[PDB]
Amino acid sequence: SGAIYVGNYRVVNRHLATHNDWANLVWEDSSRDLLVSSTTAQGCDTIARCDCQTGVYYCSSRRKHYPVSFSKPSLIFVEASEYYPARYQSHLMLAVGHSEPGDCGGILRCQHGVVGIVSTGGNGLVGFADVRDLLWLDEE
Ligand SMILES: C[C@@H](Cc1cocn1)NC(=O)c1nn(C)c2ccccc12
Ligand SMILES: [Zn+2]
Secondary structure (H helix, E strand, O other), rough: OOEEEEEEEEEEHHHOOOHHHHHHEEEEEEEEHHEEEEEEEEOOEEEOOOOOOEEEEEOOOOOOEEEEEOOOOOOEEEEEOOOOOOOEEEEEEEEEEEOHHOOOOEEEEEEOOEEEEEEEOOOOEEEEEEEOOHHHOOOO
């Protein structure tokens, strides 16, 4: 589990969105595994605006933050899970790192701020849904 709290937005994995998220919906995209809802309180996270390929992510199944090198956001075929059939996921970045299904929502960050959240994984890989292109998260 986990979310990004920037401005009056909450960014979560679409597959982990709650009824309150759907009832306060700002934007969602199944191909990216992302959903954004509105919040009453202002958040403290800031979004990175860059093309870094090194950063650190939080792994709840180890209670640890790990440094990683990761690929650029791309269209990748992801195997089936209980939340989606096997399909192409867009804006996804891969790295070598430990992960388990409940690690989704952990933040990946670089020197500039938050880069994205854990979305996919297995066999020593972890995949992150990028948010750096969502410029509107910084205003309104
Ligand atoms: C919960 C789904 C969401 C999903 C996105 O694309 C399709 N399904 N993801 C997973 O199944 C999953 N995520 N991580 C971090 C893993 C690590 C090891 C094994 C499985 C996974
Ligand atoms: Zn950066």
